[PDB]
Amino acid sequence: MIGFLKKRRSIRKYKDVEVEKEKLDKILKAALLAPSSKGLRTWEFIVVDDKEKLINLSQCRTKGGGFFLKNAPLAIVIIADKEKNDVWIEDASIAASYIQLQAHELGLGSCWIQVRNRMYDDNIEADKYIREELKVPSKYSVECIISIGYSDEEKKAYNDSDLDYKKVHFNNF
Ligand X SMILES: Cc1cc2nc3c(=O)[nH]c(=O)nc-3n(C[C@H](O)[C@H](O)[C@H](O)COP(=O)(O)O)c2cc1C
Strands (E), 11-124: 43-48, 74-81, 109-114
147/143 Cα distance (integer angstroms): 13
Residues 6+ positions from 123 with CB-CB distance below 8 Å: none
Contact call for residue 104 and ligand X (CB under 6 A): no
Contact call for residue 173 and a second copy (CB under 8 A): yes
- Cα 43 to its chain centre, rounded Å, is 12
| Binding partner selected for residue 96 from ligand X, a second copy, none, CB under the kind-specific 5 to 8 Å limit | a second copy
DSSP code of residue 95 = H
| Binding test (CB under 8 A) with a second copy, winner from 5, 17, 55, 124 | 5
CB nearer ligand X, residue 87 or residue 101: 87
Contact call for residue 36 and ligand X (CB under 6 A): yes
Of the candidate spans 4-12, 20-28, 52-60, 135-143, the one that interacts with ligand X by CB under 6 A turns out to be 4-12
3-state secondary structure of 142: strand
Contacting residues toward ligand X, per CB under 6 A: 9-10, 12, 35-39, 65, 87, 90-91, 94, 111-114
